[PDB]
Amino acid sequence: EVKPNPLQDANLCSRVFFWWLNPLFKIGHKRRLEEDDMYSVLPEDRSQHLGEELQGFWDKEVLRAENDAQKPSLTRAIIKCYWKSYLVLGIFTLIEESAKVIQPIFLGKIINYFENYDPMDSVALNTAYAYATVLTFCTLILAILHHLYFYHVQCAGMRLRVAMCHMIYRKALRLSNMAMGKTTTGQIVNLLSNDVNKFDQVTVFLHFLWAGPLQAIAVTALLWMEIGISCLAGMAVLIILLPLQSCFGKLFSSLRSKTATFTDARIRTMNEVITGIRIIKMYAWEKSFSNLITNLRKKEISKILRSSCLRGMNLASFFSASKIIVFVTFTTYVLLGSVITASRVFVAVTLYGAVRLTVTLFFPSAIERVSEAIVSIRRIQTFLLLDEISQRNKMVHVQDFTAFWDKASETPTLQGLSFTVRPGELLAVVGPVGAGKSSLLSAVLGELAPSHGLVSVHGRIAYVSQQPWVFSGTLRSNILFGKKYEKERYEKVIKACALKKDLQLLEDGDLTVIGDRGTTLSGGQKARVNLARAVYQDADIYLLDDPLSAVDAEVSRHLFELCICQILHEKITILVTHQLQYLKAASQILILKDGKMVQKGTYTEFVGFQAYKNYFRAGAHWIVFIFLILLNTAAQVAYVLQDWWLSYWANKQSMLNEKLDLNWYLGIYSGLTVATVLFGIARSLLVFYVLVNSSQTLHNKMFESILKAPVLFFDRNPIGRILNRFSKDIGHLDDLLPLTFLDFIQTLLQVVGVVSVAVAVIPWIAIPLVPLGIIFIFLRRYFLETSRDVKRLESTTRSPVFSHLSSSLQGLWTIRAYKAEERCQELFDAHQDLHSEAWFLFLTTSRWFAVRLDAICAMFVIIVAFGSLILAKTLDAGQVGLALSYALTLMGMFQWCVRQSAEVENMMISVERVIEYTDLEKEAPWEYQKRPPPAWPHEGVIIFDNVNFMYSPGGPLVLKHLTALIKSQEKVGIVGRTGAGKSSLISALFRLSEPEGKIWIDKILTTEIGLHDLRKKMSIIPQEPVLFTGTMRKNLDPFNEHTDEELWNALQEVQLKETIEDLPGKMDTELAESGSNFSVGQRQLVCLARAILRKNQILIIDEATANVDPRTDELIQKKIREKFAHCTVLTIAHRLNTIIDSDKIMVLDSGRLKEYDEPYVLLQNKESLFYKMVQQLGKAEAAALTETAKQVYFK
């Protein structure tokens, strides 16, 4: 292999510690890794090998099933070939679990030493060191050897996932055409992308479906030896935590599903704002959508907050459950008439610490994951059983042929069909239109099968489809398509396909990589690509669909005149083209109508601390975080002081031979338990409140920024980029970041609690702990700066796998036509076994960190266990029991604390990306203090004076020195060349970018007044209409100033009234999304209604009606002239008859006012560009317009 893998040769002492992985980090610490630096997978894990294992068992299972006449199931096959070897990892699960229940038994015997401490008894001390020794080995088993096991049970999921993806692909080639009607690309790619992805998860915990239950028995049996019948009270309070956890699971999932409606409703409404942001600004409707989204967000936070506070009680249960389970036991243990003893309780405290995770976390997660992963296997089992293409098998012969696309009541798609063609014979075909024209050709391939009659084909086949097809690779490779690079034949076809020049001139030659999903090439090349691919095959048979040759062009000739008519003419070619004049090339022409063969004759028949503090201080006043810090510490100090109190009671009890007053010692105990639950609850609710309240504040500050952003911003950023921040980023900020942040903080205090009791009880342990702190923080940087790349490579290598499946599935007939399936099969393995290289690093790099990180806290357990026995003279039974019963938890929590530190610091990028918009550069204020007088714009005088306009500041001048007088109520036609002037005159007049010079409206300086003063008083009919998702009333008047009778008047005048009055809600009918229930012309009629309602003294037409059919265009042109006769009107137009009667016309070119006069006075100057443009009409209509103009102005 090109990339050797050290795991093939590592000695066991190396691949237990992942010592073999160190060379990857020395690279990644110097350089950002690349896909060439990753190790190749083991021979055991190559996709080709896994597929041809499991496919064999699945084949046997299908064969067995039909012999039994009992339904096959895939879940038997993926067992019968992993049962052999996944159960081996089950054996090593025992010693992993047995460690968790043997440390507490030796933990008793070390504490039992201090209860019986004799300074001079060397034998007891040496005996205690026996128990202390095995306590580290039970710890090192659980900390070090566990990570080799846990790597292998993740690998058993990778091996299964790639075996499945390979069988899905092996099937997805051979799906019958029938099954291709049932399925769709999105469904089969969902198997690869969504469903088989579950098989990494199922295999991790799967052993807990037995080892977990067995362990819960084991801990109960031990405790019954240790603390008697009270253990049943403890275990019961643990077991009844299963249904409560399940109740929460259902309940917050229920609220989650509810929020998804408003999240979807917000985002889709947000999508309209970002798409239409130009049109929304022009109408000054920014206040409306501000209110509309604001009410959707309030209806969402009222449920996100309610669910999040519900998750607060959940996390408080994970925190506080151990303290409650302990409390009810020891309370019961004393109330049943017994006395606490430090050994007997720190054994029992530790055992609940072991079994709690298994019963509440791993065993329920195992049941959940296996439940949903078997949903996946049942979907895949449904897919594998789809019906599949039957075996097909210089000459083609077809007789009496009749077939259907499916067995149905529709007529046969081919009828009576028969023909024969032989070497030297060319066929051509004429047939249906607007239908599966290819149907005959597909029949010759066998993508449709005869219902009656016969087809036989004896040569190797080549084929082309009206849809071009190209897949992952170089353009050359698509042409070579698995054959050798025979340069002369290649050059001959590359010449004959008129490809050479265009390929080198436009796509840098055949070495160019074809972009993903084929995005690189132009269609006319991609068309030629198919023919070039086809003719390169040197097959015998050439079934040629039309290569989009319907354009009259030299290529559309040369491909036929040379390559077909001279080179290919001897080959068995069957040709379709709209260029039917070429049919004279045929030896025989098949002519069909509606799928009936009718004629057969020849032609002769014719992130950093700055980000965190902005996120936090947006959430609450800094004093609230001071109060939060007390709740964090007070929750934890209650948590530790509960267990210190249990140890203190043991010291008092063990100083007695009188009796302790249980009404006191249980009194304070229950206070500390109730305190730790209450502060455990109150912490979790408070953090969720403060952080969710931040997300509400960041959104509302950020959305108001988007509206005030200038149109330049939405030109600079594509709408997908902007909306994504409202979808994902301001999603995380309340869906998941508060939950992850609390989970980190909650556990981080747990770890600090462990080192605190350890250092408080054994004071010197701070001295070696400082190296451990110094070692850890060095290692986190050394790791994460390379782990971050492996996370990135794993994602970047994912999407080609699906891209190849999608691309292949879009082109199946072309693949099968050459029978070249195993070529596109092996190319999937080269994609699959490249993601497995990036995934194999994802597993083992996380395991490398977790091994070294657990060496730190396995050393800590060593330091406390031996440190206590070295320092035994000073210690006491209780305090050692405290220190150890805590320290033995540490290697559980510390991994999770550090894991969540990477999720938060990673997810914090969504905070910085949102904040990047929170201060985006604003437009000028919507409403300056110098509001225009109540003598509002009234005359409609508009002055342009030296107007110079650029879209970007310092960009090219799109208008230069533009200076014009438009008198009151004048009608002005505006004309320009393609791209010259255009709507840019409007963008200035609405100040969508800042004009230099001055524009006056009734001698009001437009740059002084607020944009909502300016944009309300003028009005526009924009180039494309938009109907927003909402009521017809809101599409007419979202401020609801007008009566519906007046809305009926407006809808009447655009003649939409009765169509809208027929709607089931009349004015209050909510439109379909983007108003798809109305055609483009109807939407423009709505745009006219908006102006008709507002009755502005200035109207602007943005060339829009050129998109509209003449009958509605006439109605628009009519109603404008009748309703806005007193208005000043600007008419950007192309079709000069729309403006030939304008009191003046402006002609703009190159951003300059080339003509400005009465149109005929321009036509009177035959040198004028307006006269030239009128003559460039090229028809006597120029005279009719000239006479029309003349009459208007001579009158």
Ligand SMILES: CN(Cc1cnc2nc(N)nc(N)c2n1)c1ccc(C(=O)N[C@@H](CCC(=O)O)C(=O)O)cc1
């Ligand atoms: C103490 N603690 C906090 C925590 C978080 N969520 C919970 N959720 C439940 N239902 N119950 C809990 N006790 C619980 N506890 C922990 C402890 C260990 C691991 C943990 O080790 N998780 C591993 C298990 C594998 C391993 O690393 O050993 C994983 O799959 O990520 C997580 C959280």
